[PDB]
């Protein structure tokens, strides 16, 4: 299924994911696509900061949901 990941300034990507995928795996997908280290990725959904060991389905993340990514400095 596809989800959206948007930075706080509104730069958007999609990812191809499954409900059981861990947050750690989502961050590795972001690193693959955009080159951002997982340790620079603070991800937020429905007001909650996401924990590596939990799954998309643990947060009720579904098809065409939007996650926010708090990136401090591209290339930093």
């Amino acid at each position: 299924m596809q989800i959206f990941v948007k930075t706080l300034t509104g730069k958007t990507i999609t990812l191809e994911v499954e409900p059981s995928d861990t947050i750690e795996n989502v961050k590795a997908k972001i690193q693959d696509k955009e080159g951002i280290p997982p340790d620079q990725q603070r991800l937020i959904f429905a007001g909650k900061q996401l924990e590596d060991g939990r799954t998309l389905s643990d947060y009720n993340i579904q098809k065409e949901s939007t996650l926010h990514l708090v990136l401090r400095l591209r290339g930093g």
């Binding site: 300034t9 340790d39 603070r42 937020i44 007001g47 590596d52 939007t66 401090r72 400095l73 930093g76």
Partner: protein
């Protein structure tokens, strides 16, 4: 309007805090600080976040703790000065648990508050913000404040005041944010700056059921005009210090996985709102992060709201 100015004695304390704490690497980091809720007592960590955003690199130099560094800390002082003015204009300011309001504070109290605010996140040893880490880090900052106060600030603070401001920094589980106006204004200032690292949910809708957003909170306290002006002023400080400035787009609020009742409430308070974002800037990030000179030069460059005044 008049400019927002920090006292020169305050700027001396900011230099000490920067040199001894805010410039320093986080220490509760590495393989021993990783976390998995499935195997929770596996490492020293008791929750997630210890390895998040530890530093960023600008022209080959590391800027440690960029989410809780000098620029964050100094922006909070500007906000308390601004809210002091707004509270004194309010027909009916907020009455804290001690019966006192922000409008009952003197200019000397604001100086004291400003000093305490410099230490509010100084005790952090990572970006971890789960309860145990959060509370330990606020305890550490409180003790760093008390040590420095006794060494250099006993002409300003009595021992009773040192313990009162230390308890504000500690932000104990059992204490309310609005126990006193000194503590309330410290929490409100921190609250405003969260716009740098929170999604639209926390900012406008409230992070959970029964919690007001950041911006609704300012509108309830200061009225819609002044609350929105405070928000825009913070944004201005963000741009001056090279933060990523978030976009605002109320048409997106219903699509972020939150209940429709929280979205209706935010629209009835805030109104429809749309404001462009702005990308972070490495040179300004460095200027504001690496020295009090740099940081205060940026902050004092930003125009203040039209209604800002101070008695001289």
């Amino acid at each position: 309007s008049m400019p927002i100015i920090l006292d020169s004695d305050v700027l001396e304390v900011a230099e000490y805090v920067y040199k001894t704490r805010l410039s320093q690497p986080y220490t509760e980091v590495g393989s021993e600080w990783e976390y998995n809720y499935k195997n929770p007592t596996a490492t020293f960590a008791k929750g997630d976040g210890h390895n998040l955003q530890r530093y960023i690199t600008i022209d080959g130099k590391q800027l440690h703790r960029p989410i809780h560094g000098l620029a964050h800390t100094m922006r909070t002082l500007m906000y308390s000065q601004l809210m002091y003015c707004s509270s004194k204009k309010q027909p009916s300011p907020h009455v804290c648990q001690d019966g006192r309001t922000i409008a009952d504070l003197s200019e000397l109290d604001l100086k004291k508050i400003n000093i305490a605010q410099l230490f509010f996140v100084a005790g952090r040893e990572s970006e971890a913000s789960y309860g145990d880490a959060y509370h330990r880090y606020h305890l550490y900052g409180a003790k760093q404040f008390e040590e420095y106060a006794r060494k250099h600030l006993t002409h300003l603070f009595s021992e009773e005041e040192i313990r009162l401001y230390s308890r504000c920094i500690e932000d104990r589980v059992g204490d309310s944010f609005d126990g006193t106006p000194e503590g309330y204004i410290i929490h409100l200032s921190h609250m405003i700056d969260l716009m740098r690292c929170k999604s639209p949910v926390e900012v406008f809708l409230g992070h959970s059921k029964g919690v007001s957003g950041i911006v609704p909170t300012l509108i309830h306290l200061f009225g819609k005009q002044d609350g929105l002006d405070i928000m825009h002023y913070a944004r201005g400080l963000f741009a001056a210090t090279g933060e990523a400035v978030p976009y605002i787009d109320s048409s997106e609020w219903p699509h972020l996985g939150v209940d429709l009742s929280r979205v209706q409430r935010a629209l009835s308070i805030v109104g429809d709102i749309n404001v462009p974002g702005q990308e972070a800037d490495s040179k300004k990030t460095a200027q504001a992060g690496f020295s009090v000179d740099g940081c205060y030069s940026a902050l004092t460059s930003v125009p203040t709201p039209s209604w800002y005044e101070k008695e001289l």
